[PDB]
């Protein structure tokens, strides 16, 4: 009796939450989903006088015990199933959790059960620990798979998988398998939900971020942010620092931007000879680019998650306006003044306001709890509070090796010809990956996307070298000369035209990133000559 009752209610909840347009379309095609026939377990559940052999048996208690065990099993299975898949299963977990919550509500109509929040925390190991299993898996997925296997696209604000993966060591846990009832009710319902959520598997976007914010609350966000900062610290202070140190030793000691007289074709030949060590280097496009993509993607994740948190936060506050005496600007026409209309409107909604209603009548404990709850609800993190600035400051602190900035300039003002600064190397990197690749090889965008550019721009900005980078850039200088003269010719099997448009496109992207970073980030006096 308990098994069939649980199955019948679970399928009822799943069918009830299922979309109707899809059901109608499937029926028209010829793949209709049969509804679950109704039953009459109402009388059985309420029975409490089962007299047998001169004994009184409480059938409700036994059914409650079985249903409670089944609900715990389903919640554990849902979490385990999420733990055995990638980060795109978040939508599926939320949908399955909603089904379980609704089933609990339906069963609570006739039975008594522990609150869904308590059971969810029990299955997530969060009641006795600050952090649950979901947040741990999200952090694990971010470190292993998501960061080094996704390329960002700022135009669509979406993440998509890359090609030629550089890591295959995730080795996720085996998927849990159980009866159809524990997961999305009947087998027919299971196929429909899987198809519905299959569209979210090929990308990660705002819908994933908002669900993460809802599930992780605030503790999950803070711990994730701190761990990401530690990951960035390890990468920058470790492998990245070694690569830049090695690369700086193979860069020209003195580089001077040619004069316009040489012309765009001749200026490309100068740069290929000057930077021929960097071009021949192979690990640049395999390791250093990978590491830069990791940090760049992390910063993007921090930015996007903050935006989603604010969006959810403002939506939540909108629903609390009636109970906080937060009224809109009502229409006022000729004949009446604003003060009278506002006072009347406030009086109309006076009963909704909570604090004075409890104050006039209610236990002091209720008054204190209501006051604390009101204070927590009204004060939130979208009312003049942000954290992206703090993340940028911490990243700047992680950069302390002198190699990033280099020795003091001999002229007493700034380095012009010397190449002892990081922005110089980034310009060399820009040159190498702006060369048109062959048909049998992939491009930087196809592999790393915009994460690499974000990381480089952030490093430049935090070191206060953005202006120097714009002024001193081999690619920008070549583009300017090409525009001035307008000549095309193949130099070392590198077309000159297609190169400059690529330079222009990356110049636009770099400028946009620098502007965004500067916006989020918000002297020296020389002496005059003295007569001998």
């Amino acid at each position: 009796l308990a098994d069939q009752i649980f199955a019948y209610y679970k399928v009822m909840a799943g069918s009830l939450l299922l979309d109707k347009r899809l059901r109608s379309e499937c029926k028209n095609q010829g793949a209709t989903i049969h509804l679950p026939p109704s039953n009459r377990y109402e009388t059985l559940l309420k029975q409490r006088h089962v007299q047998l052999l001169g004994r009184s048996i409480d059938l409700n208690r036994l059914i409650t015990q079985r249903v409670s065990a089944a609900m715990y099993k389903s919640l554990e299975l849902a979490i385990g199933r999420f733990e055995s898949e990638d980060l795109t299963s978040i939508v599926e977990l939320d949908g399955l959790l909603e089904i379980n919550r609704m089933t609990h509500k339906l069963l609570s109509r006739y039975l008594t059960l522990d609150g869904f929040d308590a059971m969810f925390r029990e299955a997530n190991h969060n009641v006795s620990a600050p952090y649950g299993r979901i947040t741990l898996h999200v952090f694990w997925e971010l470190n292993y798979d998501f960061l080094p296997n996704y390329c960002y696209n700022g135009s669509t604000n979406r993440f998509v998988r890359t090609v030629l993966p550089f890591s295959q060591e995730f080795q996720r846990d085996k998927q849990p398998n159980a009866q159809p009832q524990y997961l999305h009710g009947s087998k027919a319902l299971n196929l429909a939900y899987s198809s519905i959520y299959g569209s979210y598997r090929n990308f990660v976007g705002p819908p994933h971020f908002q669900v993460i914010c809802r599930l992780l609350g605030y503790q999950g966000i803070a711990v994730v942010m701190e761990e990401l900062l530690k990951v960035v610290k390890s990468l920058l202070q470790g492998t990245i620092l070694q690569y830049v140190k090695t690369l700086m030793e193979v860069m020209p000691k003195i580089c001077r931007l040619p004069r316009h007289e040489y012309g765009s074709p001749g200026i490309l030949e100068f740069f290929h000879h000057q930077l021929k060590d960097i071009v021949e280097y192979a690990e640049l496009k395999t390791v250093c680019f990978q590491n830069l993509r990791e940090v760049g993607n992390a910063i993007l994740f921090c930015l996007l998650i903050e935006q989603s948190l604010s969006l959810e936060e403002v939506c939540d506050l909108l629903h609390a306006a009636p109970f906080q005496n937060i009224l809109p600007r009502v229409h006022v026409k000729e004949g009446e003044r604003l003060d009278a209309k506002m006072k009347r409107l406030e009086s109309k909604y006076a009963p909704l306001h909570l604090v004075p209603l409890i104050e006039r009548l209610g236990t002091p404990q209720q008054i204190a709890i209501a006051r604390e709850g009101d204070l927590l609800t009204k004060e939130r993190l979208c009312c003049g509070l942000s954290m992206f600035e703090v993340i940028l400051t911490r990243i700047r602190s992680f950069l302390d090796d002198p190699i990033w900035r280099g020795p003091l300039p001999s002229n007493g003002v700034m380095h012009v010809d010397e190449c002892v600064e990081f922005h110089r190397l980034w310009s060399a990197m820009q040159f190498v990956y702006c060369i048109p690749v062959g048909t049998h090889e992939f491009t930087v965008e196809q592999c790393f996307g915009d994460g690499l550019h974000w990381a480089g721009c952030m490093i430049i900005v935090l070191l206060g070298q953005q202006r120097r980078f714009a002024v001193l850039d081999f690619c920008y200088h070549l583009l300017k000369v090409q525009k001035h003269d307008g000549k095309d010719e193949i130099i070392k099997n590198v077309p000159l035209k297609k190169m400059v448009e690529r330079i222009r496109k990356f110049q636009i992207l770099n400028d946009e990133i620098i502007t965004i970073l500067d916006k989020y980030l918000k002297v020296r006096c020389f002496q005059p000559p003295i007569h001998q």
Partner: protein, 397 residues
Amino acid sequence: YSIAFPLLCTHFMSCTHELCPEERHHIGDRSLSLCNMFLDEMAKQARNLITDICTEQCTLSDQLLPKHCAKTISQAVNKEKPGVESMRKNRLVVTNLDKLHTALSELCFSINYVPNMVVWEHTFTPREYLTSHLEIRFTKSIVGMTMYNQATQEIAKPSELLTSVRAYMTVLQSIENYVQIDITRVFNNVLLQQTQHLDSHGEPTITSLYTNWYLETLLRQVSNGHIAYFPAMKAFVNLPTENELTFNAEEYSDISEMRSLSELLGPYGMKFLSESLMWHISSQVAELKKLVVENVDVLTQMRTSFDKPDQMAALFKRLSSVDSVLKRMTIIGVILSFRSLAQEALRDVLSYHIPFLVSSIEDFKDHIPRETDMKVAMNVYELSSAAGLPCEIDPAL
């Protein structure tokens, strides 16, 4: 570099000479006009790009709806996709989204270049121009995507509207990454204004259109018999008929749709809808009272003869309007059932939004002493009803 032109207007006062004082006012007035026009045009261009970007985002989100997977389900039973548009084979190919994104970023940088400027001792704040334009455009678009045509009685489903609103909000937040303006306030003003039955300018709001459509299209047809209430599906389903209505009841009265409607409207909108439903009920009750009084003598005689069946046989035959009372009570029950669904949806939505307030209300209502007067109890029920709780007595009725 479009901010240079308003900056140039500041120099218009340098050509004035103390000898010709008459010319100063006319040149000074011309400077104020040009500056305002340039800022307005820049804001107009910005919001135009916002609409195009949001339109593309809404189109992309539309492809994720469950209704597009019917073919896959049918194929599996019997025996292009998202994410490909974000793949960049090369940067030489330029789409509409990136082109608009580049233009918007360039325009935003120009707007944010100068925090404030002074022309003829007048301080100008360009970002306020963009903020005001965004508020107007956002409100106009929201009222426009409801797609309400009175002639054909057609309205958009709440779920689709909620998705479009979320896409618009996400885009506006992305704009915040460029400019220093605060967007959370913009959301508060626009959404709160639409929540009430009339905005500041005195125009129809989202709540008013939905209330009118529900009353004049769904409940009216239920009375006519074309639709019925399905407690098993907790929604209204069109009955098998020779001619079917253009719209489908199950696509508006479902739990998901009601939750979306509550999210868009909020407690105020449901309260306004609740008041309208009670007003209709009062009209029906008043009409019934006329039929009750016109047979008062018979009913009084019938009350005291519950144990005499022979009298009841003839007393019933003398009654009038026996079917009308049942029909009207059926309409009242249908209306009350609709409110219960709305109340349940609001409670579920508010449970995971403001748990602290809901918990305090639940404790306040549950533990209220029974010996208290009716006035305080009515106040508690009204607050409880606003929270979506299932009060035994409806204060609105």
